[PDB]
């Protein structure tokens, strides 16, 4: 993920899709809205957005 015009490497915790869908999460495309927290899919894993 590039914060600016230059690219960079970042480490972020990943959340399983089953954990999100178990707690009653709304979905739209690559968006999850389980609760107050919002999750998005970057390539294959859901991370906090």
């Amino acid at each position: 993920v590039n914060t600016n015009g230059v690219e960079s490497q970042h480490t972020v915790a990943a959340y399983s899709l089953e954990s999100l869908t178990e707690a009653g999460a709304e979905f739209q495309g690559n968006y999850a809205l389980q609760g107050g927290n919002s999750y998005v899919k970057v390539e294959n894993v859901w991370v906090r957005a």
Binding site: N30, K41, V42, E43, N44
Partner: protein, 50 residues
Amino acid sequence: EDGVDKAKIQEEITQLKDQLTSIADAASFSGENWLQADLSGGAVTKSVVG
């Protein structure tokens, strides 16, 4: 070459395209052929346990 008829070459390329499709779909090992992937998301990634 304009003097060469284009129809014969047309079925030649048709056969070659069918051959390419056969190569693309047949070349699989255990269901993960690493080819003909679904690009709906456009970022499909496959990994090997290192």
